[PDB]
């Protein structure tokens, strides 16, 4: 069927939208070339509309089956509790869009008896109602990226009401937050801290005999997953041993909302239809794992492909297995491609047979290389820093929810350029406006997390260890890069950004306290006379579990 159908209203934006970095003071100090940064709006909406509407052609085979029993097998272990309504409260953002029945994330999070009262409602219409369309609100995403030699048309988020998703999350938040575990097990990407992604590709790709890699770009995921590969999704989630109300709710919300449904505007306009997977709904990320899981793990078999082992996050698919030599898996790639079109899966850019780790490219990232202290070789995980920086610039001109550029801090700690640039960067601006203790909110994994920039050191011992702040002798591969990205932004070279880091070092290390902890750590790349790092006491007190158990992007999360 078609994955969209639409009425002829326009994809409107609810209040003005920015799309040209403003001329500010402190982002020209990080980057030069402001025009070349922008954030998409709802004015580019038709381009995206016309990319994701097609129909979808989906041929179903026995290694699809086997595949799929196998999977309702391991989820036949997993027995989910339904949250209650205070747990999932507790879970929406302070920022989640307000619901158009009186109250909002606020009211909702302080068990406001308007927002407790509603959400009873619609959870006790989803036990009752098993088949009337849910309705859900599309908006144009407005993301920051760079120009390239055009430029990205936004993205279409969907999603239904507040009162809906609190009740996604007490009939699904356990499910989502371990079925993937338990069904993929290693393969499950979203269980891994990036050290332990790292460790994972490095483990799989030294136990083959002849390791041969490559990454799957499926073109618009979401808008390939048909009615069946949802129904499937659920098929899977009820061999989960559930209470008799998540069980029906499950039933419901996948008739209701995760299959289709009407689509309207932010101007109440009706849009059309959606007959894909919505972007803005709970299951999204565990539904596409287990979707692009199942469909390449059969088209493996199909490919004749051999030892195959995944490594999937949501849309994002990486392959590892024995190569057969360089034209025998020429030829088993094209044939997983076809298997996969076949599932209704097909690539956007053609896959191609990698034999160099560092070479391929997953979660937009990939393994590089860099030597410690001792100096023996530390794998960490990277990625071309264009977006972290035209992302920081953007942050840095205007006041923004979240700042990706303190999710890139954490997740990418140990990069040349993290540490480099945007430590630097950062904490001067920090240190100037006196805000070293604000905590501030970002993502990791989709998931809201506030945190204190000053716990940095701590944060990235416990998740990268202290090489972390050793690392250096960077492969030519990631030094050409960070080099060529640099040049292309107009963002100061390495010299440059020494001496303002040797500069804040200073200024934070008169400051003592934790400051002086981030100085000694953070900026020890920076001076000659470098300072003899020890591991950190409340490293160890950090619990940072919760972190890396699974994905949640589109799922309006927030773990407090
Ligand atoms: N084109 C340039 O501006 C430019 C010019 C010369 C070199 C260069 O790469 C560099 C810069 C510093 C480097 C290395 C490579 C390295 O391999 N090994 C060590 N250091 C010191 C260093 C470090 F260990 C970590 C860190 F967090 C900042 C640092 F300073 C660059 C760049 F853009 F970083 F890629
Ligand atoms: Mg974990």
């Given at each position: 069927?078609?994955?969209?159908?639409?009425?002829?209203?326009?994809?409107?934006?609810?209040?003005?939208?920015?799309?040209?970095?403003?001329?500010?003071?402190?982002?020209?100090?990080?980057?030069?070339?402001?025009?070349?940064?922008?954030?998409?709006?709802?004015?580019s909406?038709?381009?995206?509309?016309?990319?994701?509407?097609?129909?979808?052609l989906?041929?179903?085979?026995?290694?699809?089956?086997?595949?799929?029993?196998?999977?309702?097998?391991?989820?036949?272990?997993?027995?989910?509790?339904?949250?209650?309504?205070?747990?999932?409260?507790?879970?929406?953002?302070?920022?989640?869009?307000?619901?158009?029945?009186?109250?909002?994330?606020?009211?909702?999070?302080?068990?406001?008896?308007?927002?407790?009262?509603?959400?009873?409602?619609?959870?006790?219409?989803?036990?009752?109602?098993?088949?009337?369309?849910?309705?859900?609100t599309?908006?144009?995403?407005?993301?920051?990226?760079?120009?390239?030699?055009?430029?990205?048309?936004?993205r279409?988020?969907?999603?239904?009401?507040?009162?809906?998703?609190?009740?996604?999350?007490?009939?699904?938040?356990?499910?989502?937050?371990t079925?993937?575990?338990?069904?993929?097990?290693?393969?499950?990407?979203?269980?891994?801290?990036?050290?332990?992604?790292?460790?994972?590709?490095?483990?799989?790709?030294?136990?083959?005999?002849?390791?041969?890699?490559?990454?799957?770009?499926?073109?618009?995921?979401?808008?390939?997953?048909?009615?069946?590969?949802?129904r499937?999704?659920?098929?899977?989630?009820?061999?989960?041993?559930?209470?008799?109300?998540?069980?029906?709710?499950?039933?419901?919300?996948?008739?209701?909302?995760?299959?289709?449904?009407?689509?309207?505007?932010?101007?109440?306009?009706?849009?059309?239809?959606?007959?894909?997977?919505?972007?803005?709904?709970?299951?999204?990320?565990?539904?596409?794992?287990?979707?692009?899981?199942?469909?390449?793990?059969?088209?493996?078999?199909?490919?004749?492909?051999?030892?195959?082992?995944?490594?999937?996050?949501?849309?994002?698919?990486?392959?590892?297995?024995?190569?057969?030599?360089?034209?025998?898996?020429?030829?088993?790639?094209?044939?997983?491609?076809?298997?996969?079109?076949?599932?209704?899966?097909?690539?956007?850019?053609?896959?191609?047979?990698?034999?160099?780790?560092?070479?391929?490219?997953?979660?937009?990232?990939?393994?590089?290389?860099?030597?410690?202290?001792?100096?023996?070789?530390?794998?960490?995980?990277?990625?071309?820093?264009?977006?972290?920086?035209?992302?920081?610039?953007?942050?840095?001109?205007?006041?923004?929810?979240?700042?990706?550029?303190?999710?890139?801090?954490?997740?990418?700690?140990?990069?040349?350029?993290?540490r480099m640039?945007l430590?630097?960067?950062?904490?001067?601006?920090?240190?100037?406006?006196?805000?070293?203790?604000?905590?501030?909110?970002?993502?990791?994994?989709?998931?809201?997390?506030?945190?204190?920039?000053?716990?940095?050191?701590?944060?990235?011992?416990?998740?990268?260890?202290?090489?972390?702040?050793?690392?250096?002798?960077?492969?030519?591969?990631?030094?050409?890069?960070?080099?060529?990205?640099?040049?292309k932004?107009?963002?100061?070279?390495?010299?440059?950004w020494?001496?303002?880091?040797?500069?804040?070092?200073?200024?934070?290390?008169?400051?003592?306290?934790?400051?002086?902890?981030?100085?000694?750590?953070?900026?020890?790349?920076?001076?000659?006379?470098?300072?003899?790092?020890?591991?950190?006491?409340?490293?160890?007190?950090?619990?940072?579990?919760?972190?890396?158990?699974?994905?949640?992007?589109?799922?309006?999360?927030?773990?407090?």
């Open positions: 069927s078609m994955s969209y159908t639409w009425t002829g209203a326009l994809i409107t934006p609810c209040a003005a939208e920015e799309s040209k970095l403003p001329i500010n003071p402190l982002s020209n100090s990080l980057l030069r070339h402001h025009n070349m940064v922008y954030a998409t709006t709802s004015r909406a038709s381009l995206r509309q016309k990319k994701v509407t097609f129909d979808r989906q041929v179903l085979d026995d290694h699809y089956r086997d595949v799929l029993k196998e999977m309702k097998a391991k989820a036949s272990t997993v027995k989910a509790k339904l949250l209650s309504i205070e747990e999932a409260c507790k879970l929406t953002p302070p920022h989640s869009a307000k619901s158009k029945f009186g109250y909002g994330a606020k009211d909702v999070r302080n068990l406001s008896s308007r927002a407790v009262n509603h959400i009873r409602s619609v959870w006790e219409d989803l036990l009752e109602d098993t088949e009337t369309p849910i309705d859900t599309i908006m144009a995403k407005s993301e920051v990226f760079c120009v390239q030699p055009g430029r990205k048309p936004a279409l988020i969907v999603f239904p009401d507040l009162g809906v998703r609190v009740c996604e999350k007490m009939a699904l938040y356990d499910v989502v937050s079925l993937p575990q338990a069904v993929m097990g290693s393969s499950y990407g979203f269980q891994y801290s990036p050290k332990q992604r790292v460790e994972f590709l490095v483990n799989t790709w030294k136990s083959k005999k002849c390791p041969m890699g490559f990454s799957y770009d499926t073109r618009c995921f979401d808008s390939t997953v048909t009615e069946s590969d949802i499937v999704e659920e098929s899977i989630y009820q061999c989960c041993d559930l209470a008799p109300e998540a069980r029906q709710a499950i039933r419901s919300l996948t008739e209701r909302l995760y299959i289709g449904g009407p689509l309207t505007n932010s101007k109440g306009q009706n849009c059309g239809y959606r007959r894909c997977r919505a972007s803005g709904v709970l299951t999204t990320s565990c539904g596409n794992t287990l979707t692009c899981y199942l469909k390449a793990t059969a088209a493996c078999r199909a490919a004749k492909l051999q030892d195959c082992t995944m490594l999937v996050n949501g849309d994002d698919l990486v392959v590892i297995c024995e190569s057969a030599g360089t034209q025998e898996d020429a030829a088993a790639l094209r044939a997983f491609t076809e298997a996969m079109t076949r599932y209704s899966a097909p690539p956007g850019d053609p896959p191609q047979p990698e034999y160099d780790l560092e070479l391929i490219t997953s979660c937009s990232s990939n393994v590089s290389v860099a030597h410690d202290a001792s100096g023996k070789r530390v794998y960490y995980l990277t990625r071309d820093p264009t977006t972290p920086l035209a992302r920081a610039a953007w942050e840095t001109a205007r006041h923004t929810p979240i700042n990706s550029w303190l999710g890139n801090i954490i997740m990418y700690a140990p990069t040349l350029w993290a640039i430590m630097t960067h950062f904490f001067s601006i920090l240190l100037a406006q006196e805000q070293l203790e604000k905590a501030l909110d970002c993502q990791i994994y989709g998931a809201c997390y506030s945190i204190e920039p000053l716990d940095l050191p701590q944060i990235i011992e416990r998740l990268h260890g202290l090489s972390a702040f050793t690392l250096h002798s960077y492969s030519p591969g990631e030094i050409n890069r960070v080099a060529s990205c640099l040049r932004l107009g963002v100061p070279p390495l010299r440059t020494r001496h303002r880091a040797r500069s804040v070092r200073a200024k934070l290390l008169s400051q003592g306290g934790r400051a002086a902890t981030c100085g000694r750590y953070l900026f020890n790349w920076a001076v000659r006379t470098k300072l003899k790092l020890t591991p950190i006491p409340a490293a160890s007190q950090l619990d940072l579990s919760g972190w890396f158990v699974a994905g949640y992007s589109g799922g309006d999360i927030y773990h407090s």
